[PDB]
From a paper:
BTR1 (SLC4A11) is a NH3 stimulated H+ (OH-) transporter belonging to the SLC4 family. Dysfunction of BTR1 leads to diseases such as congenital hereditary endothelial dystrophy (CHED) and Fuchs endothelial corneal dystrophy (FECD). BTR1 shares a similar membrane topology with other SLC4 family members, with its substrate binding sites located in the central cavity between the gate and core domains. The TMD contains a core domain (comprising TMs 1–4 and 8–11) and a gate domain (comprising TMs 5–7 and 12–14), resembling the arrangement of UraA25.
Residue numbers in the entry:
A (entry chain A), B (entry chain B): 105 to 121, 131 to 160, 173 to 256, 264 to 306, 336 to 522, 569 to 640, 645 to 887
Write the structure that this text describes.
Amino acid sequence: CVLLHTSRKYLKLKNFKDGFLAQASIVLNETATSLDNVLRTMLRRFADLLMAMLFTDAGAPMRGKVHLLSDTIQGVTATVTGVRYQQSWLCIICTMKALQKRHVCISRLVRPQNWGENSCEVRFVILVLAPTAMEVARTFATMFSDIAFRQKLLETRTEEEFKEALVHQRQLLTCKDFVPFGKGIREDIARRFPLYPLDFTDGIIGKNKAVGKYITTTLFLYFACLLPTIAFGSLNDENTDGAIDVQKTIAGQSIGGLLYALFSGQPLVILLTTAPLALYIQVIRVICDDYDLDFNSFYAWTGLWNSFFLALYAFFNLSLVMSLFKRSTEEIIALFISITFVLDAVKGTVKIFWKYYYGHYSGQATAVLSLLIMLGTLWLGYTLYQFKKSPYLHPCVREILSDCALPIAVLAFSLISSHGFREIEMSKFRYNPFAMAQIQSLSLRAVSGAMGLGFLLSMLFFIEQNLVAALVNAPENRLVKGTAYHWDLLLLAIINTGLSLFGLPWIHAAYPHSPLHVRALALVEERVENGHIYDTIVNVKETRLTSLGASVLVGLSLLLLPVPLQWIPKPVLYGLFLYIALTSLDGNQLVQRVALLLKEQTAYPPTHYIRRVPQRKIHYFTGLQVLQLLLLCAFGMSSLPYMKMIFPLIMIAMIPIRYILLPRIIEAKYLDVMDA
Amino acid sequence: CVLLHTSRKYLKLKNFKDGFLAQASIVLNETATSLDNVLRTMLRRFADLLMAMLFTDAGAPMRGKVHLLSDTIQGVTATVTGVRYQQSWLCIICTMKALQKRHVCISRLVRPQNWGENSCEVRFVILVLAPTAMEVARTFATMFSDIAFRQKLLETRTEEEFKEALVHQRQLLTCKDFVPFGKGIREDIARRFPLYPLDFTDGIIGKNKAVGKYITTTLFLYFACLLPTIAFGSLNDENTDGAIDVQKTIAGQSIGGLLYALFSGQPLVILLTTAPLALYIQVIRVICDDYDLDFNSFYAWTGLWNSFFLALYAFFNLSLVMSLFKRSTEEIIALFISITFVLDAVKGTVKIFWKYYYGHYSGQATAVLSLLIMLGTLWLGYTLYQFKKSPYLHPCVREILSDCALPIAVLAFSLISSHGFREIEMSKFRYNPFAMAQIQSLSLRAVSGAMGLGFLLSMLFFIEQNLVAALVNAPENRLVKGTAYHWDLLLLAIINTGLSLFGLPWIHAAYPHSPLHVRALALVEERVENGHIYDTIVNVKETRLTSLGASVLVGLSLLLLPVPLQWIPKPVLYGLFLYIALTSLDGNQLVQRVALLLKEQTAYPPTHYIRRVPQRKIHYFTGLQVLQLLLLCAFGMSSLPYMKMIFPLIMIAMIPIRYILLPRIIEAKYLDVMDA
C-alpha cells in the first residue's frame, strides 16, 4: 500500500462586486468513458505527458498505482443527513512551471460519469492549468456552483452559445392573521389566474419541448390513479355492501381529478381516495346499519357538512396554522396510513381464507393461490420500485422501472392468475351494470349526527390536504408559481359536495402520488449517497395537461370495466395495497429511527443527525412518536364505530402535543436537529 | 454552499533502516460515538478550542457548516475493482504554532465507527499535534499500515501493553515437474504432519480462546451440510428410483466428512454432494436401466474406476497444471452449477404440478402451496443472506443472519407448510427404514463402460476438488499452514472408493461451503465500498474441530430421520436449491459483466477494470464466456445420457481454450486486466 495525504480547505465564493472567460476552450458532448481519455481530449483541445501530472501517480505513470486526482474543487453543503457534495461538476487544478500562460478548459459530458467518491455524477469538468490557478478555479467554481446555471449550460448546443452563456452569467453575478374574511382565497386567485394560460403552454411551446415527458407522465398518472382507484372501489364495495361500487369510485375519481386540474391553483396535487377515507366510509356504513338510516342520504348529508366546514376553514384562512405542522406528525400519519393499508390487505386475505379455505360460504386451492398472488405482486412491485435507487442502471431504465413498477406487476400477476391458473377461479370485485341522494328524507337527529361526523371528516380533510399541498410546495422543489392553499381547499369542498350528493366516494390530495407526480414532471440532478440515487429537483414544469389527461383517461376507462379490468383479482388489489404501504415509507425518518434499534449508530455518516444527537434522546423521541402512533391506531382501527370515528380528533391533537409537550420533555435543540 | 479544496499527495512509507513512541498517549476502549467527543477526550488526555481547528470549519465553529477533517493520512491500494482505502484507521494531523512540543495520541475505539467516506470502519485514530508533524504521522502510518500489527494492537488490554507492542513493532521493522512419482503426496504429508496437533489445539489453548467461535461455526457447518445433504438425498432418490435414499446420503456425507477432517491436509475444505454429481448419478441410472445392468454393481465399478484415476492423478502430481486455471473458467463452471440447481428445482416443481395439479397420478391446492412454499423459502433465505452486506447492522447481527439464513428459512417454512397448512398434505421425500455392491457380478463390457464413465467422473472430480482447494488456499486468506493438493486428492479417491463400494453417493469439495467455512473461522476487517460490507481476512484459525464436529452431528442426525427432518417438504428442498444457486453467484464477475448490458459503464468507480477496458472488448469476452457456458449447458443438461455424460470432457477442454484461443482473439493486456 501507499500512504495518501488528503488536505481539505475552504474557498470563499468569488465576489464579483473576463479574459480567461473568452480564452477558455469548451468541449461539448464528450463520449469518452474513462478519465484518461477525457483529460487527453481536453488537453489536446488546447493545441502528451501532461495528463500524468494531474493525478497522484506523478513520476510512476507506467506501474499500476492508485490513480486519483491531485487538486480538485467541488460544491459542498451541510445538512442534518450529512455532508452533501455537488457531484454534477468538478474543477481540476494543476500548477505547472513549464507552462507560460494560464489555460482553462470546460468539458461537458454526454452522460454523467463517475469521476470519484463524491463525484459519482460529474457532467462538467473544469481543468485549469497555470504557469494563479486558485483565482480562476475559484471564480469558475462560483459560477458553476449555481444550480440553474448548470442546467442553462446543459441547454446550450454550441461552443459559442456556451461561451455567451458563461459571459452573461458572469455579468449577471456582478394571531389576527385570520381576521380578514376570504383574504386567502382572493390572494390565491389573484396569484394563480394570470399564470393559467402558461400552465397549459409551459412545455407545448417555447425553447423547451416537453411533449414526450408530458406523455410519459400522463401514462404514469393514469395507471397510478386507475389501479389504486380500482382497489379502493373494491374495498368500499366490500365495506359498504355494494353501496359504493368500483364504477362509482372510477367515475368520482375522474370527475374530481378533471375539476381539480381545470380550476385549481397548484395543479400538481393529485386527488385520490385514501385508506382513512375508506375507514370513515365504513364507519358511516356501520352507523347507518345500526340506526336503520339510508346509507345514501346519511352519506350525502355527512359530505355536505364536511364541505361546509372545509369552506368555513378556507374562508377564514385557517390553513396558515398548518405552518406549525412538523415532520414528526406527518410521518406518524403516514405510518398510520400504511398500517391501515396493511390491515386492509390482511382483512381481505383473511376473508378469502375464511370463505374458501375453510368452506364457510377447491376452496383451499383458491385461498392458497390468492395468498401467493398477493405476495408475489407485492414482491415484484417492490423490487421494480427499488430498482429506481440503483446508481448503475441507466437513468431511462431506472425511471421507467419506477414509473411502471406497479402496473407491470399488476398486469403480470393478473395474467398469471387468470391465464396460468385459469383452472382455479377466485374472487373478483363486484360489477353490476349515479342517482342523487335523497337528502330531504332524513330526520333532524340524523342531520345532527351527520353534522358531527362531517366536522370530524372536515378536520381529517384539512390535515391531509394541507399536508400534501405543503409536500408539493416544498422549497426544495423549486416551484416558481405561487401557492394556493385556501382556494384549493374551497374547490375541494365544492367537488366533495358534488361527489357526496351523488354518492360517489370522497377524495383529497394523495400523499404518495403528488410528490411522484412532481418528480416525474421535474428535472433532477442525480446524487449517489451510500450507493443510492437521490434526486435534486432543479425545474418543475408545472402544467395541468398531465393531470387533465390522466383524469380523462381514468374516466374513459369506464368502458374497459366489464370485459377488461375485471380479470384483475382481489388478491392483486391487496398486493397493490401492500405495495403502496411499503413504498409510502421511503423517506420516513420515524421508520429509520425505529430500525435504528437493530442498526449501528456509529455506522451512520459522521455529520448525520443520528450521530450528533445522543442515542438516549433519539430513543425517547422515537418512543414518544411510537406512543402517538399506537394511540392513533387504537382509536382509528378498533371494532367500535363510535371510537373509530374519533381518530381525526387525535390527528388534530398531535399537533398541539408536538408543539407544547415534547419541547418540555425533550430539549428544543435536539428536536430542531431531528425534525429539520 | 461552500467551495472545498481537496489535495491528495503520496507519502513514502517510513524507512526504519523513539522518543515520541514513549511520549505518545494511548486511549483504550473509547465509547464515544461522535468525532467531537472522541477528539475532546484525546485532547484532554494530553493534560478546549483546539478541537475546532482540526476541521475545515476553522473560524466559524458555532454556525452549522461542513464538519470535515483537514489533514488526514490513510492506507490506500490499487486493484482491478478500484482504489481500496484502509478504513480500519485514520491519522489526523494538526500543525499549531501555539504549541511548543510535539504531541501524539493513539485512540482505540470499542466499535468501528464511520469517520468519513472512505473511513467507514475506523478503529484507530492517531492524532498528531505539532508546534514536524509530517515525519511523525508518516512513521505512525507506516507502523499502522501493517494488517497484522493492527490485530496485535487490538489484542492488547492495557496502555503499557499497547506501548510495548508499538516499541516492539518499531524495533522489528528496523514440463518435467510430474516426473517424480508420488513427490507431491510425500511433500504434502511432510508439510502437514507436524502441524497436526496444532490443528486440534489452535483455539482451545493459548493466548486466544476460540471456544465460542468454534461452537458457532460448528453449528453453522452442521446445518449448512445437513440441509443440502437432505435436499441432495431427495434429489438422488427421485433420480435413481430409490437406489440412493436420504439416509444413505446422510450416512455417506457424515463418514466422508469425518474421514476428510481427520486425515487430510487443509481441513477447511468441506466435502458435499453437488448438482453435477447428481446429474452424473442420473446418467448412471439411465444407462443401467437401458442396459438392464444392476445399478449398485455398475455404480460401484464406476466409483472404483474414478478413484483409480484420481489416485493416478494424485501420484503423478497433475494438480500442478491447475495453476493454469483462470477465473473465467471457474465462474463459467459456477454459473453452470447454479443453472443445474435451478433446473433441478424447476423439474421438481413441474413434476409436483403434473402429479397433483393435473391429477396425473385437492391436488391443485397442494401444487399451488408447493410453488408458494418454494418461492417463499427462496425469498426469505435470500433476504436473510443479503442482510449480511448491510453496513449499518451490528457485526454480530449480520454475522448471525448470514450464518442462520437458510436454516431459519427452512425451519420457518417447514412450520408454515406442516402446521399452518396442515390440512393440505403434500410431497415428502421417501424414507424406508448399507450392503456392499456385488462388483464381481458384472460383465467385462460393463466393466469397460464403467471404466470410461469413471474416467470422465475423475476428470470432473479433479477439476472441482482442485478449484475449491485453490479457493480455500487463496493468498488473500492468510493461511500460514501449507497447502495439500495431491494428498487431499488421494484421500478423496480412497473415501470415494469406500463410499461407492457401499452404494453411497459421491462427494467432493463444496464450492459454496468451503469459503463460507473459512470466513466463519476467520477474523476480518470490515470495508464499506458502495454501501456494501466487504471482508478482508487477517487470520484464519485453521482447526479440524469444526469440520469433525459438523460431520459427527450430521451422522448423529440419522436418529432424527423418521419423526424429525421429514416434516421438511420437497418444495422446501427445491427452495434450498434455488437459494444455493442464487447465493453462489455473489462475486461472480461473469454475472456482473452479463448484467453490465443493463447497467451503466460510466457509473463504475474511475479505476474499475470495467471503465479501464473498452466496452467492446468487455462485451466480446462476455460473449465468449456465454458461448462456453451455453455449450456446457447443452452437453451437460440434455435428455441424452450419452451426451450428458460428456460434459466433464468439455469442462477440461475449456481450460486449453482459455489458455490458447482467447489470447489470440482478445488482446493479452485486456484479458489480464479482466481476469485479475
